Amino acid sequence: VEIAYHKCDELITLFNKGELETQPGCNEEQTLEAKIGGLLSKVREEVGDVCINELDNWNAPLIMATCGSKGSTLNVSQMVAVVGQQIISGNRVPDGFQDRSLPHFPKNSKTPQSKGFVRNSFFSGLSPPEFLFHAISGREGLVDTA
Amino acid sequence: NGGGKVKPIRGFCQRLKGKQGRFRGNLSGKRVDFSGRTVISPDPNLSID
Amino acid sequence: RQNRRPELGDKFSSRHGQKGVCGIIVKQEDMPFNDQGIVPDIIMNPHGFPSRMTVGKMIELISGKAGVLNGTLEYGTCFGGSKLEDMSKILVDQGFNYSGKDMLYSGITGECLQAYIFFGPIYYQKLKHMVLDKMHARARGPRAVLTRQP
Amino acid sequence: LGVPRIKEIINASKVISTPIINAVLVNDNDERAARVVKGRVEKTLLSDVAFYVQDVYKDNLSFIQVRIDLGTIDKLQLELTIEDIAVAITRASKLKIQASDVNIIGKDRIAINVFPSENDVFYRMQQLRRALPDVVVKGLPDISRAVINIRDDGKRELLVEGYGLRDVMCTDGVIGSRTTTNHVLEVFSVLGIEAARYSIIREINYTMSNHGMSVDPRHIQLLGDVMT
Amino acid sequence: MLSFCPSCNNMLLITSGDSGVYTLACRSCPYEFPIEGIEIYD
Amino acid sequence: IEEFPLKISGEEESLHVFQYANRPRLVGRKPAEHPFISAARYKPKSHLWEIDIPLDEQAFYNKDKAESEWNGVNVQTLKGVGVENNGQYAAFVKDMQVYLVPIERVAQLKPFFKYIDDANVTRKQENRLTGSLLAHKVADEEANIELTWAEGTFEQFKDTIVKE
Amino acid sequence: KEAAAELELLNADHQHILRKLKKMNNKPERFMVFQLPTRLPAFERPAVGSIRVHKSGKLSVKIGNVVMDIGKGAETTFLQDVIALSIADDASSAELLGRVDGKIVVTPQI
Amino acid sequence: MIVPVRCFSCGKVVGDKWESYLNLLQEDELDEGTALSRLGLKRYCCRRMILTHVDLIEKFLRYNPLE
Amino acid sequence: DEINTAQDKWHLLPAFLKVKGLVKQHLDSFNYFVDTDLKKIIKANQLILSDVDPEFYLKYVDIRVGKKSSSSTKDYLTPPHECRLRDMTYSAPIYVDIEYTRGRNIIMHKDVEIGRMPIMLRSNKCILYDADESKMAKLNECPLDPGGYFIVNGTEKVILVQEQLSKNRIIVEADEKKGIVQASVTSSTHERKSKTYVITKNGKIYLKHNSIAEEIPIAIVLKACGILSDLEIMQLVCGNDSSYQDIFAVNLEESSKLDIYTQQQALEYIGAKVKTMRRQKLTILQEGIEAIATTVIAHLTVEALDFREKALYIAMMTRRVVMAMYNPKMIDDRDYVGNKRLELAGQLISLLFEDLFKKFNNDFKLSIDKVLKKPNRAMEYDALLSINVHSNNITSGLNRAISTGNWSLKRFKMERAGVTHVLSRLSYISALGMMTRISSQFEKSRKVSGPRALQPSQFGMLCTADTPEGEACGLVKNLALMTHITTDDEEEPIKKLCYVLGVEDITLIDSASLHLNYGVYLNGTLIGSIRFPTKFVTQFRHLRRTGKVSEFISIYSNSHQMAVHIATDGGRICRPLIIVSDGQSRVKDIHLRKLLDGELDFDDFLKLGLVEYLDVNEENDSYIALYEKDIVPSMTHLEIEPFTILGAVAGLIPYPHHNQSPRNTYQCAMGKQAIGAIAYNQFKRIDTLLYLMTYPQQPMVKTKTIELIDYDKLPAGQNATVAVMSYSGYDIEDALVLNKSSIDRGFGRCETRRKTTTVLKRYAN
Ligand SMILES: [Zn+2]
Numbered sequence A: 001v002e003i004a005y006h007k008c009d010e011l012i013t014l015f016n017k018g019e020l021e022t023q024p025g026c027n028e029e030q031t032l033e034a035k036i037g038g039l040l041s042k043v044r045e046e047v048g049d050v051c052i053n054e055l056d057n058w059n060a061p062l063i064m065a066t067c068g069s070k071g072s073t074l075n076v077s078q079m080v081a082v083v084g085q086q087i088i089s090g091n092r093v094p095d096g097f098q099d100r101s102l103p104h105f106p107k108n109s110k111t112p113q114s115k116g117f118v119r120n121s122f123f124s125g126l127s128p129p130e131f132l133f134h135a136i137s138g139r140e141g142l143v144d145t146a
Numbered sequence B: 001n002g003g004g005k006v007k008p009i010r011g012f013c014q015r016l017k018g019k020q021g022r023f024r025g026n027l028s029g030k031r032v033d034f035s036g037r038t039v040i041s042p043d044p045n046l047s048i049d
Numbered sequence C: 001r002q003n004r005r006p007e008l009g010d011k012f013s014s015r016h017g018q019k020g021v022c023g024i025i026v027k028q029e030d031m032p033f034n035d036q037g038i039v040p041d042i043i044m045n046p047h048g049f050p051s052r053m054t055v056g057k058m059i060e061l062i063s064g065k066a067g068v069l070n071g072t073l074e075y076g077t078c079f080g081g082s083k084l085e086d087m088s089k090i091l092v093d094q095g096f097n098y099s100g101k102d103m104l105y106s107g108i109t110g111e112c113l114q115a116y117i118f119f120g121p122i123y124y125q126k127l128k129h130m131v132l133d134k135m136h137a138r139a140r141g142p143r144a145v146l147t148r149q150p
Numbered sequence D: 001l002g003v004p005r006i007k008e009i010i011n012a013s014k015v016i017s018t019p020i021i022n023a024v025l026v027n028d029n030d031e032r033a034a035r036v037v038k039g040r041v042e043k044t045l046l047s048d049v050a051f052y053v054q055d056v057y058k059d060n061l062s063f064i065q066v067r068i069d070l071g072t073i074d075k076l077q078l079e080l081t082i083e084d085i086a087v088a089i090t091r092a093s094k095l096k097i098q099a100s101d102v103n104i105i106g107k108d109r110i111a112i113n114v115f116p117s118e119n120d121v122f123y124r125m126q127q128l129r130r131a132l133p134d135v136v137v138k139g140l141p142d143i144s145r146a147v148i149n150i151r152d153d154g155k156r157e158l159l160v161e162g163y164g165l166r167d168v169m170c171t172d173g174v175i176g177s178r179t180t181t182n183h184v185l186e187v188f189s190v191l192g193i194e195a196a197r198y199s200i201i202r203e204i205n206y207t208m209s210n211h212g213m214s215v216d217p218r219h220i221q222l223l224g225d226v227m228t
Numbered sequence E: 001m002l003s004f005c006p007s008c009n010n011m012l013l014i015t016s017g018d019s020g021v022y023t024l025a026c027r028s029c030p031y032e033f034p035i036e037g038i039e040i041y042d
Numbered sequence F: 001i002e003e004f005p006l007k008i009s010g011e012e013e014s015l016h017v018f019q020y021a022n023r024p025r026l027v028g029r030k031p032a033e034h035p036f037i038s039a040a041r042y043k044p045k046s047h048l049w050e051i052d053i054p055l056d057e058q059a060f061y062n063k064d065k066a067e068s069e070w071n072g073v074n075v076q077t078l079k080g081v082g083v084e085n086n087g088q089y090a091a092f093v094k095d096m097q098v099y100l101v102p103i104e105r106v107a108q109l110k111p112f113f114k115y116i117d118d119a120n121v122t123r124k125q126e127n128r129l130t131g132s133l134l135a136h137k138v139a140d141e142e143a144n145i146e147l148t149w150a151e152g153t154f155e156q157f158k159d160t161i162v163k164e
Numbered sequence G: 001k002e003a004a005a006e007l008e009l010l011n012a013d014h015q016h017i018l019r020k021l022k023k024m025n026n027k028p029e030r031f032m033v034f035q036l037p038t039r040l041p042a043f044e045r046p047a048v049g050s051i052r053v054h055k056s057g058k059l060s061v062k063i064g065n066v067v068m069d070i071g072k073g074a075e076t077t078f079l080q081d082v083i084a085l086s087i088a089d090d091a092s093s094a095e096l097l098g099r100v101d102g103k104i105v106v107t108p109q110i
Numbered sequence H: 001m002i003v004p005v006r007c008f009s010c011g012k013v014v015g016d017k018w019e020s021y022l023n024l025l026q027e028d029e030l031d032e033g034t035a036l037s038r039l040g041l042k043r044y045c046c047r048r049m050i051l052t053h054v055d056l057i058e059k060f061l062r063y064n065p066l067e
Numbered sequence I: 001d002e003i004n005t006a007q008d009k010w011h012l013l014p015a016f017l018k019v020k021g022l023v024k025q026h027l028d029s030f031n032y033f034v035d036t037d038l039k040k041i042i043k044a045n046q047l048i049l050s051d052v053d054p055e056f057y058l059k060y061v062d063i064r065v066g067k068k069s070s071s072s073t074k075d076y077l078t079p080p081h082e083c084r085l086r087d088m089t090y091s092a093p094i095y096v097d098i099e100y101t102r103g104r105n106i107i108m109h110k111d112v113e114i115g116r117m118p119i120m121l122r123s124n125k126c127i128l129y130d131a132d133e134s135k136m137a138k139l140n141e142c143p144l145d146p147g148g149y150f151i152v153n154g155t156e157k158v159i160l161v162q163e164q165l166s167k168n169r170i171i172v173e174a175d176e177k178k179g180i181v182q183a184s185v186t187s188s189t190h191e192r193k194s195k196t197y198v199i200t201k202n203g204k205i206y207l208k209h210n211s212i213a214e215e216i217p218i219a220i221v222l223k224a225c226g227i228l229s230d231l232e233i234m235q236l237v238c239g240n241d242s243s244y245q246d247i248f249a250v251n252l253e254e255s256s257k258l259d260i261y262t263q264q265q266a267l268e269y270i271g272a273k274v275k276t277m278r279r280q281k282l283t284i285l286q287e288g289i290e291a292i293a294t295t296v297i298a299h300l301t302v303e304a305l306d307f308r309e310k311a312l313y314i315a316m317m318t319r320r321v322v323m324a325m326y327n328p329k330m331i332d333d334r335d336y337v338g339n340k341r342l343e344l345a346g347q348l349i350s351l352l353f354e355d356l357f358k359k360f361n362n363d364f365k366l367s368i369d370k371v372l373k374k375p376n377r378a379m380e381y382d383a384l385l386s387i388n389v390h391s392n393n394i395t396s397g398l399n400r401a402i403s404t405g406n407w408s409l410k411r412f413k414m415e416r417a418g419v420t421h422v423l424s425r426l427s428y429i430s431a432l433g434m435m436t437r438i439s440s441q442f443e444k445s446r447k448v449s450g451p452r453a454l455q456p457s458q459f460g461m462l463c464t465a466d467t468p469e470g471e472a473c474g475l476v477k478n479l480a481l482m483t484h485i486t487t488d489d490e491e492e493p494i495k496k497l498c499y500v501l502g503v504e505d506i507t508l509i510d511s512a513s514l515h516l517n518y519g520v521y522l523n524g525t526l527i528g529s530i531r532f533p534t535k536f537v538t539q540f541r542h543l544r545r546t547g548k549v550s551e552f553i554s555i556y557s558n559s560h561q562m563a564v565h566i567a568t569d570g571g572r573i574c575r576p577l578i579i580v581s582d583g584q585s586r587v588k589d590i591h592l593r594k595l596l597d598g599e600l601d602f603d604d605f606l607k608l609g610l611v612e613y614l615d616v617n618e619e620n621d622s623y624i625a626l627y628e629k630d631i632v633p634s635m636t637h638l639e640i641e642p643f644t645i646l647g648a649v650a651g652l653i654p655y656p657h658h659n660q661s662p663r664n665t666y667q668c669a670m671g672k673q674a675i676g677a678i679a680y681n682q683f684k685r686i687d688t689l690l691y692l693m694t695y696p697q698q699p700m701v702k703t704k705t706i707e708l709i710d711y712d713k714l715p716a717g718q719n720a721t722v723a724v725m726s727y728s729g730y731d732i733e734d735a736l737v738l739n740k741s742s743i744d745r746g747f748g749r750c751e752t753r754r755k756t757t758t759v760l761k762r763y764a765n
């Protein structure tokens, strides 16, 4: 997780006081958006790789989800390893407030954990900022069905 | 009359018509006889079918 | 008034989001016991936890078994509550596995269950939707005057 | 790609969101003729061509006088000098303006003299200053925009938002024998019937293999059949 | 041309002038204009 | 940590003060270029002061417009409502000291035209009343006064002097 | 950063009001206008205060009970050119006086 | 309501010890876990009901007929 | 035993909830009603007078409920619980004092009943109010029932907290096509009235107000609004330079092609297009024909006498639409709570009241006419006991409303329904579950997904853990544990105060504003645009947290949009939390020993300047931290505890932070269906369908939220010793498997209670 904080931190910190390589995303500021979305996804899946592989033999989130029936490797990855990027409406959580998501964050924070991201497993518990986020994605799914 | 402004004075074209009305929810959707409704519960030992 | 025995087909909850109905009511002799002699009362399907991905309950079980030993209601709460890692210490000296798992003996056979099992106190609240209300049947009943269909 | 797309394909209405035109390019290039045809059809470049706009009065003289950057025509290769866009103005002017003389002295100049509820010179003057830095210059008027794409690795070719499929089919420098689109109805107005159908079961089967499952072509061919 | 009325402070507009020349008045409060207009905008 | 004195003023026939939309500061060396002629009015309750400045014939004036319908060779027509609200005080610096004065009613000043009243002159021929309209009609009824105009410094030094 | 520049514009005013203030030291007709809080919060009505700029460009303005009452800057009038009038004995009114140049407010600090 | 007369698993009679429990707590102030232990319940499901089970019947006897 | 600065803040939430109660919303608004708004409504209409007999009048003076001036609480009333068995309606009588005109030298008075008011259990006037465990017995009723629910006709019902869109406020919406409607819908007292505004076509934009015929170019109105300088309109609504210059002037054109000078005719263009006055009163066809409408069109927000306020108000509104026409975004959705204001039972029952009481007066007139029509002797006749015969329309009509949920308001001509409920007792949790439930209403049609999802602004001021599926025509939410719904406060004092700080009245203003600072909006109305915004703020906030105008009257700066807002409105959501001055908090950790001693409690920190109530706006402007463990002296406030966010229902779930939220949502949709012990008066009361359990038990792991709702003294459930295993093969999806010889030992046994009412009635024979 820390390898990503400074990687995307490098991308955002040189976008404000300088320019960068903008991928064919037409306009800019979505450049680092696709960057951060891709990077955090690959990191989250990668931690799930070492979650399923180096996990012990003979234990149920494996023997079930690794193979047979209920859940899948992504699911157990969300339990033991990490959860990441609660993603609503296709991207990170938009501003309800001004220049910020929640009252707990400074202004102009583009770092993760500021929009719909979590560094903590369900097992380690959550922080309120990431809990309120995780109380959104699953809900946008619920209405999206209803 | 009344005159407390009773809106659904319509009695006829609609009873024949819409939503769950006559034509669809009633004639094509006929409520049936010889039935039953219950909560479920698994039974492996019982065969299929 | 009437006092309903919790008949087959009655919604129970785990207060944690598990929403289910009892299956076969086994007798006593059946289902595991282990060393104390206790017989697990409700017995619950494992599969529900991973796909629903709720580990809160699965901690609540630990906190429960740890509670009843010290004789103390043990707390838990949103962003807080009793820190799990000490729960172990309370059990391990009193003989129960540092994690909730423990051995059991299948009541049917009577030989050691080939895998460990995980149990403690959990609070299962019983719901409305008692079945004896909700079962329904008809042979030929009354018909509405207008449509003359049931 | 959602189920509401099936809503519109089945429902088969006139207007549709994101009506993509898929059109294969003559050859494989990212340069020139690649961009050229894109310049041959894209919306209107007039404001992007507009440089700045100019109005001055000398006594009775009423001037609408603007200039243009030719280096932009050098950026995006287009076919014009001026008199092309000059006559083009009075062509498209039928929306509002009236046909009359226009002239260049050199290097992109226009000359518009207008004249006769009074202050008509000022009132028409205003609307002229207003809508003129909009109207179509070169392009196909029903097409919003266009993108050159990359196929696999080797091939790279454009797709274009718009309803035409006839003009752009015709438009020079794109092999027309293969051009593909959505919104079956407008296929029915150019190729028609058997083509429209054979498209509808291609696109149904397409979009409904993305969301998952599989329906087999058997059923779909039947849907597109009784629809056709 | 959208400019300002000195004094009267209302508006400006180009008007049809007598003997042509159009002058430039301020409608609905007295003003006139020198013409020889240097008019520049982008 | 020194002291710069100030003291109050009395009533002294009130005060008032215009600010108007017409003529900002000049861009040049001396931004001021003061107004002229006064020739104003007042009425009780609602004040609504007619304010008047003549027009130049060399200004690109167009006597034709003045000779068209409405005669504009007359003075320029400015008026507006006004309001008082407390704490608003003028002041002036007399040597080392400074004298504050109360203000009372402050009015904006908006140019407009009795000329469209002339546009009416040709246009017309060929319970309730609770609100601002109750105030408008009354404002029209009781409207009527000829005020002179003066300039100078008399007591504004001395009344402030004698009252410290 | 916000407050730094903001609170700096205070002293920027102490300069502003300071210069054109002492430029009024003469006796032409020129009027600077203030705003004071109501209720006249000094001490009582027994029957006033004064001004200073303390060292390093402060404002110490006191009224009564040696109350510290300080306000600076202003809203910017500009385009409005403001003229001070007088009612002369009902009819035969309108003696014009001092026009306007400066404007500043005053607020009890906290 | 009243303490049950056996647990829901073991079947050891808990009906008795609830009195002796609470008495043993109030008089002779002593901590819970140690209390129940020398009160004679080692198995924990037998134990919960002593520990658990608020006694309502008091709070239900305010409402009796006679008052 | 030094108390840890980390958790010691815990001791707040009880002391908060201890004095000022859990369910205070429905109480206060009520107790504010009976003690105040009655003395208003009659102060509105205190004189009914016919047209006849020029000497008469009927002058109300005072209103009282249950207190005729004998003792403080009514000397006798009927006990509520016993009132529940008889199908009666719990009631305290109304008392009014009157002045007559009857015969020579009378002008006399009395203390009279006009009818009876269904007050609310555990209000001020209730018998239960302030009675401890003894009266509870003798009154045969529950101690732990939170109350705040009415009781009528013997059934047991609640007025449900009703959300309503922000009223008298600006809103700006864009759309595909359209052209970005702006709207301001203002209401108070008479005439709730909408005013839409929008572009019609192509930079050519118009006021639609159904009171007018069709539309007006906004340049015309703004002229007629009394700013005549024209081109200074552009300098006002547009800005200095930016882009905005052109976009607006295009509009300003078509005013020039027509007419000008509000002095007479520019107003006349409006009244020319207004509809008729409906015969009489047309007399005002004038140039002052429409001068009525220009102060009262829609906006009762300003009105007054000269025009400049409303003028510049409509101006500053016109700015925000052209700002939207520039670029999308940079606008206002209607989602985040600050743009929505819920409202309690307090204003509801009055609005309903002053109607029923109003009809009472209109018709009591017409009944006082019949006597005075036909002369007999010299007509005097008390002309007073006729209130008895002509009453109830106040009472029985009121019961009809409060029970049924049909509110017919003739005065607003606005009808709403489904506004009350049977309070469902299946559990002690459901008792306060129906209680404290936010019913959103309106929502146009369903097809917009906007007024649906859960907005991040909701943090801690509304329960995140339930939005159940009873949606249908509306939405249902719940409050947090710590919310204080701000009431109405006041206006004129905060106005003159704002001046006292040195804001300058709009009349003095440059008429070039937008460049300079921000502007200061009271309730969305422009006042001063003061110099030095931030210092103004810190000054004002400093006053609120200690000296004056407390609770609400929030304030927040703004940047992108240039404004500073002072909002005094009532019916609004606020929440507690601690100020951190410099690095640390204002608590200083010795204050809490000074607290739990009991000589301190809560609502004392306001006067000590420790905690105050923020607002979704204010806190959005502010900066908050979670734990004291992490602070930076950039901060403002820290939440007192994080777990206040989960609702009274949600607080049940142990370790919620380990779940995925839909499970907690289904749980807040379940636990209120857990059968349980109900209340201590359980067996004595007789209800319609009431379950209950034989051997309830405390949930083994509690939560610091449970203990404070007394949930362990009415536990709903069994505590079951439970393996986790696959057994049988009767298991599969969610299906449990129980235990005989256990279930038979008294596990999970239920009872059920039904009532059958049979009314016996005499017949006219
Ligand atoms: Zn003019």
Ligand SMILES: [Zn+2]
Residues within 6 Å of the ligand: C038, H007, H008, H009, H010, H011, H012, H043, H044, H045, H046, H047
């Ligand atoms: Zn046991």
